[PDB]
Design a protein around this ligand. Sequence first.
Ligand SMILES: COc1cccc(CN(CCN(CC(=O)O)Cc2ccccc2SC)CC(=O)O)c1O
Ligand SMILES: [Cl-]
Ligand SMILES: [Cl-]
Ligand SMILES: [Cl-]
Ligand SMILES: [Fe+3]
Length: 498
Amino acid sequence: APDEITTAWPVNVGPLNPHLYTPNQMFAQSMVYEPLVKYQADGSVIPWLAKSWTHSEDGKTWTFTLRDDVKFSNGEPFDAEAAAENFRAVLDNRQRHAWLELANQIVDVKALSKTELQITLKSAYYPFLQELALPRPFRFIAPSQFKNHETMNGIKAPIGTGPWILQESKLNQYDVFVRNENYWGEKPAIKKITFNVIPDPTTRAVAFETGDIDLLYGNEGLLPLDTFARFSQNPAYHTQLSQPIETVMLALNTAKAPTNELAVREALNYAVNKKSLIDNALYGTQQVADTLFAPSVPYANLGLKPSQYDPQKAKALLEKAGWTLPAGKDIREKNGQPLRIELSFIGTDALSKSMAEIIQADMRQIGADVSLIGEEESSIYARQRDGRFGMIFHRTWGAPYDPHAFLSSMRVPSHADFQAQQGLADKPLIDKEIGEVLATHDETQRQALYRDILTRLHDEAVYLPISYISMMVVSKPELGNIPYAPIATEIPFEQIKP
Ligand SMILES: COc1cccc(CN(CCN(CC(=O)O)Cc2ccccc2SC)CC(=O)O)c1O
Ligand SMILES: [Cl-]
Ligand SMILES: [Cl-]
Ligand SMILES: [Cl-]
Ligand SMILES: [Fe+3]
């Protein structure tokens, strides 16, 4: 067993290098590795590996007082030296962390003693603590497990301070974690967690039905949503659906015809029946999104005006912009050129494909010809990074990333959002303002900057918001109520208490 559970994940957890990205899975990195400060649902951080901290008046020099009772799972001490060596290891790979502005802000990290850790920043970076709280990269592996005094070229054993220890991994089959019996904090009720590698959502559902696994935990892609709804009525099962955690949306390329035209992007934003999309493809399990960030997101309750489903207005917008229908044709033309838009998505993702088909159909109704380009995962991310798309499925990042980190990343050219925004006359101003808002401690100016950035993105119709999606759970009743983590990408296994 009752203290052992079996769950599933679409891939292995990875080697659990704390400082690297794919194929490392964030929830698993967070099981093993811990932050200086821990993110809370109310947006604050609490003391964690750091028990307290102070900062200079200019807000650029921070000194953390670390716990003195923490050991890595291999018995070696966690101290300021170990922490400082981890920051060096991360920043020796600084290029790869360009998306995360703290990685460009940290000027210096040194241990002043065994318990005092000093971090110096370029500027008074206000999201400092929240970005230290992220699953990666600023969490701590035993320096003994560095490879030639680095982590960027790999690690030895994935030795963290956290409540879970990786017991063993087997590529394309499973990962097994056990409870850290020498953990400095609260001991988890569960002693062993086995992750079965099951890439297909239907196969995950079947694995649960057959009893092969005890728990499914994930976003809207966790399992087929009609099946989830059926499960929710099955008295032998337990299901849960969280309050929304992030936005799913289309990104429209402002630098590529015909989505380079504001009037086209505005029309597209009136063309989709989002309610029907969610009821048709998402089995009514998710919420309609009118804005890049839900009004419940920090700094984003701005009274932005929704573009409600209105095919009539979509048509009028296109007509006014010179996109009219030729005799005997359903697809509009302007300067002899058809209103054709390519929508790129992961071809094997049945849910994305379903939504893509609905979007294609809705947009045909107002005279836009959407071509579906379903491709393998690597091809889609290649398109995102280089802007080789007309429209692309996209999502925000959830707490604590939304909105500051998501916005920060819009400045990085090798991301979808920069690429989608590249055609905007105001893109330089937007990027300047994103830089400014992150270093602003004038709360009035901070809100004004966020308002301007988000309003410009909204008014310029860069995105086609579709849904605010939720975390979902399917479980054996004996496991009880399953908690959600403050960080949308973490899974609070240590809080499960049958
Ligand atoms: C579930 O995945 C994420 C959940 C929340 C935020 C992000 C954004 N990531 C930003 C850094 N990405 C690295 C990666 O995910 O491998 C950047 C990036 C590069 C290429 C393609 C995608 C992405 S993240 C959309 C944070 C992270 O991965 O640590 C996620 O990727
Ligand atoms: Cl991945
Ligand atoms: Cl890059
Ligand atoms: Cl400017
Ligand atoms: Fe990422």
